[PDB]
Design a protein around this ligand. Structure first.
Ligand SMILES: *[C@@](C)(CO)[C@](*)(O)[C@H](CC(C)C)NC(=O)[C@H](Cc1ccccc1)NC(=O)[C@H](CC(C)C)NC(=O)[C@H](CCc1ccccc1)NC(=O)CN1CCOCC1
Ligand SMILES: *[C@@](C)(CO)[C@](*)(O)[C@H](CC(C)C)NC(=O)[C@H](Cc1ccccc1)NC(=O)[C@H](CC(C)C)NC(=O)[C@H](CCc1ccccc1)NC(=O)CN1CCOCC1
Ligand SMILES: *[C@@](C)(CO)[C@](*)(O)[C@H](CC(C)C)NC(=O)[C@H](Cc1ccccc1)NC(=O)[C@H](CC(C)C)NC(=O)[C@H](CCc1ccccc1)NC(=O)CN1CCOCC1
Ligand SMILES: [Cl-]
Ligand SMILES: [Mg+2]
Ligand SMILES: [Mg+2]
Lengths: 204, 125, 222, 233, 222, 195, 212, 196, 195
C-alpha cells in the first residue's frame, strides 16, 4: 500500500546540442501482476512534452487536467505554452493539492520556440521544481536511472548520439527494477521535428 | 553417575567381562536357526525341570520385532528384554523416517551396535 | 541543507549550500535556496523544498501588493510577521525553516523563522541539517563590527563547514549581500569547490547500438 | 535492554605531530538535571593511554574497574610489565572493543561511546573510537555526541587529512580543543563550563590537566538583542 | 528500546577479469548525517590470495572478516598448510553467516580472487549466507546506482551490434586490468555525485597470481 | 463477487462473470448476474465490496441512459469508459470510496470495432484484448498470452473462455458456481444460456 | 520465483527461472534454483535463498551418508522426509521454503515430493511453486497430457516458466531445464528470456498483447 | 526556561534566562523572553516559543485597541486577555506565562498563568522548567516591600541557581524593571552570576 | 485440510475426509487422503494446521503400532482414543501445541460394537453417533439430527453421508474437491473407491 510503487514505471529526460530527449517504459501492473504493456507515460501539449510516473490513475487524471489547462491557455493567450511557463503551471497545480497530493513524479521536456534553448525539469509529488542542465529521472527505478545517467551522460550530444545514451540509460535501469519495463518509448525533439522510437527490450 | 570401566583389557589382550558374558550365553537354553529356500525357521529349547508352568502367559522365547522380523536368543532372559524393546522402537522409528520397514541386516546391525556400546561404556556390563 | 545569515557594518549577508536530497540520493546538485521576497529583502530556506518556495512566493506576492498599496518600500518585519502567522496557522505542517534578511527605511535586519511559527533575532544565525557545523564556525570566528568582506568570508566559511561535514549539505555556496543605500547583489555560485573531475572514459555509444522496433514522425503543429 | 540514567556528554580528541590530545567535561547529567559536577570522564591507563568515555556513568565506572583490573592482570608473572610488555593503547582498545561488541550481541550493552587516545611504543599516535554497538573507527579527529556535530568541523580545519598531522604543533592543537569546548558550552544543553584535558606526547609523555574552565566568552552582544521581531525596547 | 543494528553506509564493488580480479570500496564511514572517518578501510587481504569486504553494519562487518581471517589460519593448521581455494572460502563464509541465521550479520559480503584454473573470481553473499559466483557485483548503499551501469559496460547488456537490426548481440569479452580500473573509478565518482553516504576516498585491491596490489584515489569530500 | 473476465475478439467482446454470492460460511446465491447494460451496445461487469458494486453499476447505468434520452444518441464505448473512470477517480479521494472494479465491453458502431476496457477502483483505465479483475488474472492472463490470437471468431473466443473457466475451477480455492457469459457485438447484447 | 516439476510418460520434467529479488530490486538474473543432490536426485528452490541453499545442500550430505551406511541410494520419499522433518523442527522460527524433491529409484519409479517450511509434505504428479506459480499452472494444466513426448514435455516446462517470467514481476532472467529418466537426470541448458521470448513469440505466434 | 516576576516597594521586576532549546541543542543562547504587551505591562514567556509569541502578539494587539478606545488598561485586564486565549485554546497550546505590570493606583502586580489557563495573582511568581529547583530558595528568601537593589539580588541569585541545576536554562539573565520612573532593562552575564 | 466427517451405524463406522490441499490461491492437490490406520480395526482422520496434522497422525500411528508388536494384541478403540486425547492434552500447554483435530473410528472386537470418537486440538474427547470438525458441523449436525437412526445399515449410512456432502458442496464457500470415504467394521478397514 505505497501509492507510488503499486503500478510501477519510469521516465527519463536528457538535453543535447540544440535538442532534448524524453523516454519512458510501457509497463502498468498491480504490484506483482503485469497488466498492460501499452501504457505510455509521456504526453504533449503543443511542443511541450510531459512525462508522468507514479500512481496510474493520477497520471491519467493529470494528463487530462493539463490538456484542459493548456487548451484554455492557448485560446486566451493566442499562442502555444512554453516549457518554462508550463513548468510553473505544473508546480502551481501540484501544490494546490499540498495536503492531499497526486502521487506522481512528473517531468517536463521541450524546446523554447522563441529562444531555441533546450529545457528540462522534474518535480516531486507536491510540486517542487527541479531544473537541470543535463538530465532528469523519475519512477520506481530512479536510483538505477541516476546511476546510469550520471556515468553515461556527456554534454552537447547530437540528436542521433543522444538517442543511444538515453535509451541505454533507460533499458539497463529498467532491467534492474521488477516494476519497470515491458517495452519502452523514446522521443527525440529538435526545433521543428520530433521523432518517436519504440525500443526492443527484454519482456520479463 | 556410576562411571567405573568394568569392561577393560587384560595383559593377554582379552576383555574378560565380554568373555564371561559369552559363558552366560553358553549356560542359556539352546536356540537354533535354519533358513531354507523360501523360509527361515527358529527352534528353541525349553528346560523340563520346570513343571506346573503356565505356558499361556510365560514369555515366549521367540519375539516379533516387527511384522516381518523375529528375534530369538540364548543367555540371560532379563537382558534380552532390553535388546528386544530397543529393537522394536528402532523398527517403528525407521518406518517413520524412511517410510519403509527395516531390513534384517539393518535391524541386526542396530542390535549389534547396542551390544557393542555396552562393552566400552562406563558403569555398565 | 546548510543556511546562514550574518550582520555587518552597513547591512546584512546571507548564504546557502546548493544540495537537494531525496532520502540518501542527491536530487539536485545546484539548486537555489536563496529567494527574493522583495528587491532588498531576501530569504534563505531549509526543510521541505516545496514549502519554502511556496511560502516565500506567497508572502513575496502579498508584500509587492502591500508595497504598491502603501507607496512604500517593504520592511523586513512585515515579511517576518506575514510568514510567522502563516506558518503558525498550519501548526508546523508547512515545513519551512527560513532565515529572513534585508534592508529597508528602518535599517538592516536579520531574523530566522521555524515551521511552527517562532521567530528569533540575532547578529549571526544558522538553520538546516548542517546548522551545527555552521554554528560551530560562527561561534568561533564571529565578532562585533564586521566589514562587508569579513562577513561574506565568515558566512561562506560557515556554509563550507556544512558542505564538508554534513551529508545533508554539499556542492556550491550561494551568497546574497544586502547593504544599506545600495542595490542587493545576488552572488549565485559564489564558490564552486566541488567540480567533478574528468571521467576516465567516454561512454559515447556506436550509432545503432540500441535495438529499435518502430519509428514515426510526431506531429506538434496544428 | 537498558536505558541510560546518569549520563556524560561529548568527548573530543585529535592528533598532532608528536602525539594526541583528548578532553571531556566534568558533568554527570540526570536527564535535564545537571546532577553531579565532580565527575572525571578521562581515565588514564599507565603513562601512555587515556580512555575518554561518554554515556551512562554507572557503565563508565564498570569500565574503569575493568581497566584497573587489566593493569593488575598484566603485571602478573611479567618482569617487563613496566617496559617491553607494558599495556599498549592498541591492546586496551581492542579489549574494550571486544567487550562492547559482546555486550551488544547479548542484547545488554554498555551504554557508552568511548575514545581511546594514546601513543604506541614505536612512537605512533593512536586514536580510535568504539560505542555501545561495537562500531569502531579511527580518524585524525574524533568526537562523541554533540562533539561529533560541532567539534569535528572545527578540529578538521586544523587537521583535515593525514598529511596535516606533522604540520600541527601541540600549541595549535590544544588551542583548537579548548575552543571546541567553549563552543560546546554555548550550544550543548547538557554540558558544563568545567572540564579535563589530557595530552599524550611521545617525548614529554602523559600530561593530565584538571579543573580547566571555559573562558574568553562572547556574551556582550546579548544586551542589544530585544524581543523577537518588532519590539524596540 | 535498544536497537543492536546500525548503518555505516559506504559501497563496494567487485569485478573479475581473465587472469585477475579487483575488489574496490570507498573509505567513508558514516552514521546518520555525520562522517565518522574519511579513511576507514573495509577491503582486506585475508591471505591465500583472497580479498574480502563486508559492507553495511561495520561492527558485524569487522566481526565477520575477523572470523574468516581466523578460519583461514585454522585451515592451515588442520590441513597441512593447504591453500584455501576461493570456492572453499565461499562455502566456509556461508556457514559463518548462516550460523547466525536468527540474529544475522547485517552485511553485504563480497570476496574476490583467482579460482583453481587461475581465472578471476568474484563471489557475493547476502546477510544470511546465500552465495553466487559472478563476473560483476556492486554492494552497499550505492549498489542500485552502480550495478545497472556494470551490466551495461562489463556484461554488455542491452548492447547490440550496429546495423544487425538488433539481432546480433555485442560479443562478451574479458576486460584488461586498465579498462576495469577505469570502470571502477567512473562508477565511484558517479556514485559519489548522487549518493550522500559515498565519497572521501576510493581504495582498490587487485589480485593476480603475483599477489595483492593496492591503488588509492581521492573522491569528493562533500 | 470475485471472478470477472473479458475477451475482445475480431467482431465481438465476451464477458464472463461468476454466479456465486457468498456470505461468511454460506453461499447465499448461485445464479447472480454481475453485470448491467449501460446502452444497447455497451455492457459493464463488476466486482468488489458488497453493496458498493450494484449501487455503483446502477448509478452509472442511470447516467448513461439519461444521456441517451437527452441527445437521442448512443455514447461510444470509449466515451462511456472515460466517464466511468472519472467517477471512480473522484471516488477514490472521497470520504468513503466506491470499492468496485469493472470491465466495460462495447461495440463501437461508428468504427465497427469491439472494445474492452479494464478499470479498477482507483480509476485506472486500460484498453485490452483480454482482461480480468482480482485473483482471476493470476491464472487466465498467462493462459491467454499463449492461446489468444487477434483474428479469432466469437466461437473461438468462447472455447478460449471455457479453457479459462476450467483452469479456475481446477486451481481456485473457492467455489464460484460457474459463470454467466454475455456477448457484445454489432447486433447488441445477448446472453449464452448453456455454459 | 517460479518453479515447476511434472511427471509424465517419459519421466520427470523440472523447470525453474533464475531471478532473485530484494523487494523491487532485481538482485540477480543468474541464480541456480535447482540443486544437483546426486546423479538421480534433484531439488528445486522457491523462497529464502540462504535457507534453500544451506539446507538442501545439507540434505545432499545426509543422502550421501545414507548410501555409505546402507550401501544403497536413498529413496525419494526418505530424502524428502529428512528435509520435511528438519524444517518441522524449525516451524515458527521463520524459515521460508517451498521445494520439490524430484528423482527416480527402482522401487518408487519417477517421484515428486512437495515440501515447504510449515511442514507440509505431498507426493504428486504436478506442482508449481513460487510467486509466479499460478501463471505457470495456467499454461501447464491447459496443455498437460500424460502421453507428452520428451521433446514436447521439455518445451511445455520451458514455455510455462516463460509465461510466468513474463507476467510475474518477481520472476525472470532465464529458464533452467532438467529431464529425469530411469538412468538419472539430464541437463537441458540455460535459456535466456531476453532471446527466448521473441523466439517463442515469432515461431509460436503467441504473446499478441506485446508490441511486436 | 527559568522565569520569574517579583513585586516590591517601588513596583515590579521581571526576570528570565536566555536559553532556547531543541532537545539538547541550544537554538538560541541570547533569547529575550521578557516581552512588552503595553508601555508598563510586560510578560515572561515559558513553554512553546511559537505559542507564547503568537499569544503575546495577539495580546499586544488587543491592548493597543483597548488603549485607543478606553485608555490605559489595568494589569488585571491584560492578564484576563492572556487567560482568555490560554484557557479557550488549552488543547492546542503549551504556554506558561507570567504577566507583570505597574499602575499608579495598584502599584506593582503579578499574575501567573499555568498550562490549564487558570489565573493566580501573587506577590511573586516563578515558572519554567528550572523553577522547580528554586521553590525552596525563593520561599525562604522572598520578603514583601523589598527595595529595588534587594529585589534585583533576589532575582539574580534565584535564576543563578535555576540555571546552575536546569540544563534547559542558561545564557544571560535578563531583567526588566517596572516603576513610576519608567522602564529599565538590565542584563547580567555568566562571569558575574555563576560565582555567586 | 478442512472437512472431516464421521458416522457410526449399527455394525460399522464411516469416515469421510476432503481431498483438497489448498495453499494461498492455489489448490495444490485434489487426491489427498487425510487419514492413518492406527491398527487393523482403528482408523483416525485429521484436520488442522499444515504440517502438524500429518506429523501428529504418524506419531500416534507409530506408538499404537509399537504397542501392538510389544503385546501381540490390538488396543481397543476406547483405549486408543484415551491415549490420543492425553497426547493432545499434554500438547495444548506445550511451547508449541499441535493444532490438530481428529476423529477416531474403530470396531471393538471384544464388544462387537462400532465406536466413533471426536477429539479436538485441546484434548476434548466425546463419543458420538455422528461427528464433524470445523465448519462442516454447522451444516451436517442439523441434517443428521433429522435423518439419522441408530439401527441403520452401512449402505443407509453411505446414503446419509452422500446427503451431507451434497449439502456441503451446495453451501460451503470453498471447493474441497470431494471426499475419500472409508468404512471400519468387524472385517477391518476398506476404502470406497467410487464416491
Ligand atoms: C537540506 C539539503 C536537507 O534538508 C535542505 O534542508 C533542503 C532544503 C532545500 C532543497 C530547499 N531540503 C531538502 O532537499 C528536502 C529534504 C526533505 C525531504 C523530505 C521531507 C522533508 C525534507 N528535500 C525535499 O524536499 C525533496 C525535494 C525534491 C528533490 C523535489 N522532496 C522530497 O523528498 C519529497 C518530500 C515531499 C514531502 C511530502 C510530504 C511532507 C514533506 C515532504 N519526497 C519525495 O519526493 C518522495 N517520493 C518520491 C516518489 O514519489 C512520491 C514521493
Ligand atoms: C523468486 C525469485 C522471488 O520470489 C524466488 O522466490 C527466489 C528463490 C531463489 C532466490 C532461490 N527468492 C528470492 O529471491 C528471495 C526472496 C525472499 C527474500 C527474503 C525472504 C524470503 C524471500 N530473495 C532472497 O533471499 C535475497 C537473495 C538476494 C541475493 C539478495 N536475499 C535477501 O532478501 C536477504 C536475506 C533475507 C533475509 C532472510 C532472513 C533473515 C534476514 C534476511 N536480505 C537482503 O539482502 C536485505 N536487503 C538487501 C538490499 O539492502 C537492503 C536490505
Ligand atoms: C525552557 C527551555 C523550557 O520550558 C523555556 O520554556 C523555553 C521558552 C522560551 C524559548 C519562550 N522553551 C523552549 O525553548 C521550547 C521548549 C519546548 C520544546 C518543545 C515543546 C514545547 C516547549 N523550545 C521551542 O519551542 C523550540 C524553539 C525552536 C527551536 C526555535 N521549538 C521546538 O523545539 C519545536 C517545537 C515543536 C513543538 C512541540 C510541541 C508543541 C509546540 C511545538 N520542536 C521540534 O522542532 C522538535 N524537533 C524535531 C526534530 O528533532 C529535534 C526535535
Ligand atoms: Cl522566543
Ligand atoms: Mg517478469
Ligand atoms: Mg556534505
Amino acid at each position: 500500500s505505497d501509492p507510488s510503487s503499486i503500478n510501477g514505471g519510469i521516465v527519463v529526460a536528457m538535453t543535447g546540442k540544440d535538442c532534448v530527449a524524453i523516454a519512458c517504459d510501457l509497463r502498468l501492473g498491480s504490484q506483482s501482476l503485469g497488466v498492460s504493456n501499452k501504457f505510455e507515460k509521456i504526453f504533449h501539449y503543443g511542443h511541450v512534452f510531459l512525462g508522468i510516473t507514479g500512481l496510474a490513475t493520477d497520471v491519467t487524471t493529470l494528463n487530462e487536467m493539463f490538456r484542459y489547462k493548456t487548451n484554455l491557455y492557448k485560446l486566451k493567450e493566442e499562442r502555444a505554452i512554453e516549457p518554462e511557463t508550463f513548468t510553473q503551471l505544473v508546480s502551481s497545480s501540484l501544490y494546490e493539492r499540498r495536503f492531499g497530493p497526486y502521487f506522481v513524479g512528473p517531468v517536463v521536456a521541450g524546446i523554447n520556440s522563441k529562444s531555441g534553448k533546450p529545457f528540462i525539469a522534474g518535480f516531486d509529488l507536491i510540486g517542487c521544481i527541479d531544473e537541470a542542465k543535463d538530465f532528469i529521472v523519475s519512477g520506481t527505478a530512479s536510483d538505477q536511472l541516476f546511476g546510469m545517467c550520471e556515468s553515461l551522460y556527456e554534454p552537447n550530444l547530437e540528436p542521433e548520439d543522444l538517442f543511444e545514451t538515453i535509451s541505454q540509460a533507460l533499458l539497463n535501469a529498467a532491467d534492474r527494477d521488477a516494476l519497470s519495463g515491458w517495452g519502452a518509448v523514446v522521443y527525440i525533439i529538435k526545433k521543428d521535428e520530433v521523432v518517436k522510437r519504440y525500443l526492443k527490450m527484454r519482456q520479463d | 553417575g556410576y562411571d567405573r570401566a568394568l569392561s577393560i583389557f587384560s595383559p593377554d589382550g582379552h576383555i574378560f567381562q565380554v568373555e564371561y558374558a559369552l559363558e552366560a550365553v553358553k549356560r542359556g537354553t539352546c536356540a537354533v536357526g535354519v533358513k531354507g529356500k523360501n523360509c527361515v525357521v527358529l527352534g528353541c529349547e525349553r528346560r523340563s525341570t520346570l513343571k506346573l508352568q503356565d505356558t499361556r502367559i510365560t514369555p515366549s522365547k521367540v519375539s516379533k520385532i516387527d511384522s516381518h522380523v523375529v528375534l530369538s536368543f540364548s543367555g540371560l532372559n532379563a537382558d534380552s528384554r532390553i535388546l528386544i524393546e530397543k529393537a522394536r522402537v528402532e523398527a517403528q522409528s525407521h518406518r517413520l523416517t524412511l517410510e519403509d520397514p527395516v531390513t534384517v541386516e539393518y535391524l541386526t546391525r542396530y542390535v549389534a551396535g547396542v551390544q557393542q556400546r555396552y562393552t566400552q561404556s562406563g558403569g555398565v556390563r | 541543507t546548510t543556511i546562514v545569515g550574518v550582520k555587518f557594518n552597513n547591512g546584512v549577508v546571507i548564504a546557502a549550500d546548493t544540495r537537494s536530497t531525496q532520502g540518501p540520493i542527491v536530487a539536485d546538485k545546484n539548486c537555489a535556496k536563496l529567494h527574493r521576497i522583495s528587491p532588498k529583502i531576501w530569504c534563505a530556506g531549509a526543510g521541505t523544498a516545496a514549502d519554502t518556495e511556496a511560502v516565500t512566493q506567497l508572502i513575496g506576492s502579498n508584500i509587492e501588493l502591500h508595497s504598491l498599496y502603501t507607496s512604500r518600500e517593504p520592511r523586513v518585519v512585515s515579511a517576518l510577521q506575514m510568514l510567522k502567522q502563516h506558518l503558525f496557522k498550519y501548526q508546523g505542517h508547512i515545513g519551512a525553516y527560513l532565515i529572513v534578511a534585508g534592508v529597508d527605511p528602518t535599517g538592516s535586519h536579520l531574523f530566522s523563522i521555524h515551521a511552527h511559527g517562532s521567530t528569533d533575532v540575532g547578529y549571526y544565525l544558522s538553520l538546516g541539517s548542517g546548522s551545527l557545523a555552521a554554528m560551530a564556525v560562527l561561534e568561533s570566528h564571529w565578532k562585533q563590527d564586521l566589514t562587508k568582506e569579513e562577513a561574506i568570508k565568515l558566512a561562506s566559511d560557515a556554509i563550507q563547514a556544512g558542505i564538508w561535514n554534513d551529508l545533508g549539505s554539499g556542492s556550491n555556496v550561494d551568497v546574497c549581500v544586502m547593504e544599506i543605500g545600495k542595490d542587493a547583489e545576488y552572488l549565485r555560485n559564489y564558490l564552486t569547490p566541488n567540480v567533478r573531475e574528468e571521467k576516465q572514459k567516454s561512454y559515447k555509444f556506436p550509432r545503432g547500438t540500441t535495438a529499435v522496433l518502430k519509428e514515426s514522425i510526431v506531429n506538434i503543429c496544428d | 535492554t537498558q536505558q541510560p540514567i546518569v549520563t556524560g556528554t561529548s568527548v573530543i580528541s585529535m592528533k598532532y605531530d608528536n602525539g594526541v590530545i583528548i578532553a571531556a567535561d566534568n558533568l554527570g547529567s540526570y536527564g535535564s538535571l545537571l546532577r553531579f559536577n565532580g565527575v572525571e570522564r578521562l581515565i588514564p591507563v599507565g603513562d601512555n593511554t587515556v580512555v575518554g568515555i561518554s554515556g551512562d556513568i554507572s557503565d563508565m565506572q564498570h569500565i574503569e574497574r575493568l581497566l584497573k583490573d587489566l593493569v593488575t592482570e598484566n603485571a602478573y608473572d611479567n618482569p617487563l610489565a613496566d617496559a617491553e610488555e607494558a599495556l599498549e593503547p592498541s591492546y586496551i582498545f581492542e579489549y574494550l572493543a571486544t567487550v562492547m561488541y559482546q555486550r551488544r550481541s547479548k542484547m545488554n550493552p554498555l551504554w557508552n561511546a568511548i575514545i581511546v587516545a594514546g601513543v604506541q611504543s614505536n612512537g605512533d599516535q593512536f586514536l580510535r573510537y568504539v560505542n555501545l554497538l561495537g562500531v569502531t573507527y579511527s580518524s585524525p579527529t574524533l568526537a562523541t555526541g554533540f562533539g561529533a556535530h560541532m567539534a569535528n568541523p572545527l578540529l578538521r580545519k586544523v587537521v583535515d587529512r593525514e598529511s596535516d598531522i606533522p604540520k600541527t604543533t601541540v600549541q595549535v592543537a590544544e588551542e583548537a580543543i579548548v575552543n571546541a569546548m567553549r563552543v560546546l558550552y554555548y550550544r550543548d544543553a547538557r554540558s558544563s563550563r568545567n572540564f579535563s584535558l589530557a595530552i599524550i606526547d611521545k617525548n614529554t609523555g602523559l600530561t593530565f590537566k584538571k579543573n580547566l574552565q571555559v573562558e574568553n566568552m562572547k556574551w556582550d552582544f546579548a544586551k542589544d538583542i530585544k524581543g523577537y521581531g518588532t519590539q524596540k525596547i | 528500546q535498544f536497537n543492536p543494528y546500525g548503518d555505516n553506509g559506504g559501497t563496494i564493488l567487485g569485478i573479475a577479469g581473465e587472469d585477475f580480479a579487483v575488489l574496490a570500496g570507498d573509505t567513508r564511514n558514516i552514521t546518520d548525517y555525520s562522517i565518522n572517518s574519511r579513511y576507514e578501510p573495509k577491503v582486506f587481504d585475508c591471505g591465500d590470495n583472497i580479498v574480502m569486504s563486508a559492507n553495511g553494519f561495520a561492527a558485524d562487518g569487522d566481526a565477520l572478516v575477523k572470523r574468516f581471517k581466523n578460519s583461514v589460519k585454522w585451515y592451515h593448521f588442520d590441513h597441512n598448510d593447504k591453500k584455501l581455494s576461493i570456492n572453499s572460502a565461499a562455502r566456509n563464509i556461508q556457514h559463518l553467516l548462516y550460523g547466525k541465521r536468527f540474529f544475522p550479520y547485517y552485511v553485504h559480503t563480497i570476496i574476490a580472487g583467482l579460482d583453481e584454473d587461475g581465472k578471476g573470481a568474484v563471489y557475493s553473499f547476502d546477510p544470511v549466507g546465500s552465495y553466487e559466483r559472478e563476473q560483476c557485483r556492486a554492494g552497499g548503499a550505492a549498489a542500485s546506482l552502480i550495478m545497472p551501469f556494470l551490466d551495461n559496460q562489463v556484461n554488455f547488456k542491452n548492447q547490440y551490434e550496429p546495423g544487425t537490426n538488433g539481432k546480433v548481440k555485442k560479443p562478451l569479452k574479458y576486460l584488461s586490468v586498465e579498462e576495469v580500473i577505469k570502470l571502477v573509478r567512473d562508477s565511484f565518482t558517479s556514485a559519489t555525485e548522487r549518493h550522500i553516504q559515498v565519497g572521501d576516498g576510493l581504495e582498490i585491491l587487485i589480485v593476480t597470481k603475483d599477489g595483492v596490489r593496492k591503488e588509492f584515489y581521492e573522491l569528493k569530500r562533500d | 463477487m470475485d471472478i470477472i473476465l473479458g475477451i475482445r475478439v475480431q467482431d465481438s467482446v465476451i464477458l464472463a462473470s461468476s454466479k456465486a454470492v457468498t456470505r461468511g460460511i454460506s453461499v447465499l446465491k448461485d445464479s447472480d448476474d454481475k453485470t448491467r447494460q449501460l446502452s444497447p451496445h455497451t455492457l459493464m461487469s463488476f466486482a468488489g465490496e458488497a453493496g458498493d458494486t450494484v449501487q455503483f453499476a446502477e448509478y452509472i447505468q442511470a447516467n448513461i441512459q439519461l444521456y441517451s434520452i437527452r441527445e437521442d444518441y448512443e455514447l461510444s464505448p470509449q466515451a462511456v469508459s472515460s466517464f466511468v473512470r472519472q467517477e471512480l477517480a473522484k471516488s477514490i479521494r472521497s470520504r468513503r470510496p466506491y470499492q468496485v472494479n469493472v470491465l466495460i465491453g462495447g461495440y463501437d458502431k461508428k468504427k465497427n470495432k469491439p472494445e474492452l476496457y479494464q478499470i479498477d477502483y482507483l480509476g485506472t483505465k486500460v484498453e485490452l484484448p483480454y482482461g480480468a479483475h482480482g485473483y482471476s488474472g493470476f491464472y487466465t492472463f498467462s493462459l491467454l498470452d499463449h492461446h489468444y490470437r487477434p483474428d479469432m471468431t466469437t466461437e473461438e473466443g468462447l472455447d478460449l473462455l471455457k479453457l479459462c473457466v476450467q483452469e479456475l475451477e481446477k486451481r481456485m480455492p473457492m467455489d464460484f458456481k460457474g459463470v454467466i457469459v454475455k456477448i457484445v457485438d454489432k447486433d447488441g447484447i445477448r446472453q449464452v444460456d448453456d455454459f | 520465483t517460479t518453479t515447476l516439476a511434472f511427471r509424465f510418460q517419459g519421466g520427470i520434467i523440472v523447470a525453474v527461472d533464475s531471478r532473485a529479488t530484494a523487494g523491487n530490486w532485481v538482485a540477480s538474473q543468474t541464480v541456480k534454483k535447482v540443486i544437483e543432490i546426486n546423479p538421480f536426485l534433484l531439488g528445486t528452490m522457491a523462497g529464502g535463498a540462504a535457507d534453500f541453499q544451506f539446507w538442501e545442500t545439507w540434505l545432499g550430505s545426509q543422502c550421501r551418508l545414507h548410501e555409505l551406511r546402507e550401501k544403497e541410494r536413498i529413496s525419494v520419499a526418505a530424502a524428502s522426509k529428512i528435509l520435511s522433518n528438519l524444517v518441522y523442527q524449525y516451524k515458527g522460527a521463520g524459515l521460508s521454503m517451498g521445494t520439490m524433491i524430484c528423482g527416480y529409484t527402482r522401487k518408487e519409479g519417477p517421484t515428486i515430493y512437495y515440501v515447504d517450511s510449515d511442514g507440509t509434505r505431498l507426493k504428486g504428479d504436478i506442482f508449481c511453486v513460487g510467486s509466479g506459480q499460478t501463471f505457470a499452472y495456467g499454461v501447464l494444466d491447459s496443455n498437460y497430457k500424460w502421453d507428452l513426448s520428451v521433446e514436447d514435455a521439455l518445451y511445455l516446462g520451458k514455455r510455462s516458466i516463460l509465461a510466468a517470467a513474463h507476467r510475474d514481476a518477481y520472476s525472470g532472467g532465464s529458464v533452467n531445464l532438467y529431464h529425469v529418466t530411469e538412468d538419472g537426470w539430464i541437463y537441458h541448458g540455460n535459456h535466456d528470456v531476453g532471446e527466448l521470448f521473441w523466439k517463442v513469440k515469432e515461431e509460436e505466434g503467441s504473446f499478441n498483447n506485446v508490441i511486436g | 526556561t527559568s522565569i520569574m516576576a517579583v513585586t516590591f516597594k517601588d513596583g515590579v521586576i521581571l526576570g528570565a534566562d536566555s536559553r532556547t532549546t531543541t532537545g539538547a541543542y541550544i537554538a538560541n543562547r541570547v533569547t529575550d523572553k521578557l516581552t512588552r504587551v503595553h508601555d508598563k505591562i510586560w510578560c515572561c514567556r515559558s513553554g512553546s516559543a511559537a505559542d507564547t509569541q503568537a499569544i503575546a502578539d495577539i495580546v499586544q494587539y488587543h491592548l493597543e485597541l483597548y488603549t485607543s478606545q478606553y485608555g490605559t488598561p489595568s494589569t488585571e485586564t491584560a492578564a484576563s486577555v492572556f487567560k482568555e486565549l490560554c484557557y479557550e485554546n488549552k488543547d492546542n497550546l503549551t504556554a506558561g506565562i507570567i504577566v507583570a505590570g505597574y499602575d499608579d493606583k495598584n502599584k506593582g502586580e503579578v499574575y501567573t498563568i499555568p498550562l490549564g489557563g487558570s489565573v493566580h495573582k501573587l506577590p511573586y511568581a516563578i515558572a519554567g522548567s528550572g523553577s522547580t529547583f528554586i521553590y525552596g530558595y525563593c520561599d525562604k528568601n522572598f520578603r514583601e516591600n523589598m527595595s529595588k537593589e534587594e529585589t534585583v539580588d533576589f532575582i539574580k541569585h534565584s535564576l543563578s541557581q535555576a540555571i546552575k541545576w536546569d540544563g534547559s536554562s542558561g545564557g544571560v539573565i535578563r531583567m526588566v524593571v517596572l516603576t513610576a520612573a519608567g522602564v529599565e532593562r538590565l542584563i547580567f552575564y555568566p562571569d558575574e552570576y555563576e560565582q555567586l
